[PDB]
From a paper:
In summary, we conclude that Francisella BfpR is a response regulator of the OmpR/PhoP family that negatively regulates the expression of some FPI proteins and biofilm formation and positively regulates resistance to AMPs. Response regulators are transcription factors composed of two domains, a receiver (REC) domain which is connected to a DNA-binding domain through a flexible linker. On a molecular level, the response regulator propagates the signal by accepting the phosphate onto a conserved aspartate located within the REC domain. Alignments of FTN_452 to other bacterial response regulators suggest that FTN_1452 is a member of the OmpR/PhoP family.
Residue numbers in the entry:
A (entry chain A), B (entry chain A): 4 to 34, 36 to 125
Write the structure that this text describes.
Amino acid sequence: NPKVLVADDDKKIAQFIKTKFEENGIDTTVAFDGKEALFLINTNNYDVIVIDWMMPYLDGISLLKILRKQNINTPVIILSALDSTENKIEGLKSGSDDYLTKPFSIDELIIRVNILYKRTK
Amino acid sequence: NPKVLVADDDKKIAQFIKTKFEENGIDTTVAFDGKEALFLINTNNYDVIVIDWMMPYLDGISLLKILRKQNINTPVIILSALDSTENKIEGLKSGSDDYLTKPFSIDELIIRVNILYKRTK
Ligand SMILES: [Ca+2]
Ligand SMILES: [Ca+2]
Ligand SMILES: [Cl-]
Ligand SMILES: [Cl-]
Ligand code: NA
Ligand code: NA
Ligand code: NA
Ligand code: NA
């Protein structure tokens, strides 16, 4: 099973994602803000990381930039309310492997998680 | 009259702000994205600058950081949908003189424009 971290402060959305991921073959840990996410990412191995764009302590893009500075190169998917092409490009340049605008498709998110897991062996 | 630039890509909100400002004694120029705002700020003198948090080409915080790097110290008010205290603090540390969460009060915005104009003689 892919091992994935999901970081969002919206507990309903986080629970929804976790339920759908574990329905499929994806073992999922939830972090409810950027501080907990940073800690978990630095003390556990994940195959893919799914990060919401806005949470307490560290927003998603800021956490991603910290990770890439730390030479943590785990595949990252950003979930963001900033839906312009310019903001998608900024998220990708910041080091994300994909960038899904909200409202997002859970089916697409699961497929992209699996694609990234397959690519990173 | 205070001379003020208002930057937002939402034309209805920009027009509303301009109407209320000019009703009061505030001469107002509108810029509809961050590129036009940057150009106008570098080619005109303004007493106060009101910047929306998200627009094409340059978001409000990024424009503010560019301005403060350029040693342009004109008072800036940020209008933002990011309403947590943490995000307000980040906006202030980025160089803004005030930070109003949306939905904002036009009456408060006018009063704060006038306070900043009075303080900068
Ligand atoms: Ca969130
Ligand atoms: Ca806007
Ligand atoms: Cl956007
Ligand atoms: Cl917020
Ligand atoms: Na499981
Ligand atoms: Na932040
Ligand atoms: Na006028
Ligand atoms: Na930006």
